[PDB]
């Protein structure tokens, strides 16, 4: 296909909306500490994905499209039993506002993928909170970096478009 095009978003809305994301995603747990790192199922803003300022000017729909993908995926994860299992954490918690804001910005990009595909519904499990806890933070980890680029994408579009 040809690289998609179209709907230029609410850069400002997005900029601020993303910005908040980078805050919420650096929560961290005293006992878990900061998750590293060893690779290696999660989406990524890659090189050829056009979110780099230069590509962003040429186009950015593909990039923005990936960001929606990312949000959608993290969004799913955050909803899963991963963050809902115990060490049971509250819907008012930093993580609550997280899933909350994720989705929100997902919506702000693709006000529902009209619902054709948009799946990639998460791996699964793990049962027993330790693996769980770790997983929670590994995802939060990946997220910090994800959301970080997005914020740059928007904050940039926001200023230059």
């Amino acid at each position: 296909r040809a690289v998609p095009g179209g709907s230029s978003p609410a850069w400002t809305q997005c900029q601020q909306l993303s910005q908040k994301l980078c805050t919420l995603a650096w929560s961290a747990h005293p006992l878990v500490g900061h998750m590293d790192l060893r690779e290696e199922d999660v989406p990524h803003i890659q090189c050829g994905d056009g979110c780099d300022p230069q590509g962003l000017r040429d186009n950015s729909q593909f990039c923005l499209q990936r960001i929606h993908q990312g949000l959608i995926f993290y969004e799913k994860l955050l909803g899963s039993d991963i963050f809902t299992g115990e060490p049971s954490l509250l819907p008012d918690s930093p993580v609550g506002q997280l899933h909350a804001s994720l989705l929100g910005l997902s919506q702000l990009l693709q006000p529902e993928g009209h619902h054709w595909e948009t799946q990639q519904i998460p791996s699964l499990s793990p049962s027993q909170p330790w693996q769980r806890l770790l997983l929670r933070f590994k995802i939060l980890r990946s997220l910090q970096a994800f959301v970080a680029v997005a914020a740059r994408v928007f904050a940039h579009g926001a200023a230059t478009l």
Binding site: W26, E39, C51, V149
Partner: protein, 298 residues
């Protein structure tokens, strides 16, 4: 046994002083087929003849520079270093465990930006018989090019007791993407050669995690009139990734009680004697805060 560099070889003693160690065979590299002899380091002692000497290796007395001779001529060498497994874990005797940032560091790298160029600094007490080869790539399962610029000794300072030697290399990821969200870490492998002893030190990290910006550029004060209160302003450091519209930074203006502003300016109260210092961080990711940019109160 493997070749760390021409005529120089590392012998992996897992189990260090234990077992039979390892059975090395050395080779005189020369046309010469007759009257070859082997000597180790100095010692006039012939250890064997033939174009190949076969030895056993357990401790350091087992390694050193092997030399072959014919008719009093040196024909070729073969320096053997040891890589030693101390109590089930390789050795680190070389680099200083850099104030644990955090714990067992040796290689502390950082980048002034997402350009893909970072520097790693390591610490050693050792002043001499030090060789340092730096290899960097991004990802193991399918390496990815990182050009490393050779370990200089960036500076040397005093730690009170004895001198601390600070090395460093620059590395450029050959084909880098500053905008991208890395999924694969860089590894920097450092071949630490001190005399006969061989050690490797490693670092794996994402550039996003080693970004530390230069301190704010052009920090300025501007008093308000008959006011002990000032218009602070600064600029993005020259080195920050461009554009700043994308690669944004956030600031901390501390007088001395700090204040935070994603602006390149703030208005403070000079308590005339103190001064304003400002520092930046990635606006969107908790990288490292730069050093302070400071300007004396008016």
């Amino acid at each position: 046994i493997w070749e760390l560099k021409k005529d120089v070889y590392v012998v992996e003693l897992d189990w260090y002083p234990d077992a039979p160690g390892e059975m090395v065979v050395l080779t005189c590299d020369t046309p010469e087929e007759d009257g070859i002899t082997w000597t180790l380091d100095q010692s006039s002692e012939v250890l064997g003849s033939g174009k190949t000497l076969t030895i056993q290796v357990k401790e350091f007395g087992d390694a050193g520079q092997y030399t072959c001779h014919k008719g009093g001529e040196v024909l070729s060498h073969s320096l053997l270093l040891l890589h030693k497994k101390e109590d089930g874990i390789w050795s680190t005797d070389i680099l200083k465990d850099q104030k644990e940032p955090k714990n067992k560091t040796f290689l502390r790298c950082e980048a002034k930006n997402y350009s893909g160029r970072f520097t790693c600094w390591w610490l050693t007490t050792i002043s001499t018989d030090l060789t340092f080869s730096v290899k960097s790539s991004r990802g193991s399962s399918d390496p990815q090019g990182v050009t490393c610029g050779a370990a200089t000794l960036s500076a040397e300072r005093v730690r009170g007791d004895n001198k601390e030697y600070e090395y460093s290399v620059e590395c450029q990821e050959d084909s880098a993407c500053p905008a991208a969200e890395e999924s694969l870490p860089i590894e920097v492998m450092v071949d630490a050669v001190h005399k006969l002893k061989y050690e490797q030190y490693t670092s794996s990290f994402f550039i996003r995690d080693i970004i530390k910006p230069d301190p704010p550029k052009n920090l300025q004060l501007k008093p308000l009139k008959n006011s002990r209160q000032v218009e602070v302003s600064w600029e993005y450091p020259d080195t920050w990734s461009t554009p700043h519209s994308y690669f944004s930074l956030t600031f901390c203006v501390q007088v001395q009680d700090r204040v935070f502003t994603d602006k390149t300016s703030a208005t403070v109260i000079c308590r005339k004697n103190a001064s304003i210092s400002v520092r930046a961080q990635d606006r969107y990711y908790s990288s490292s805060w730069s050093e302070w940019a400071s300007v004396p109160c008016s």
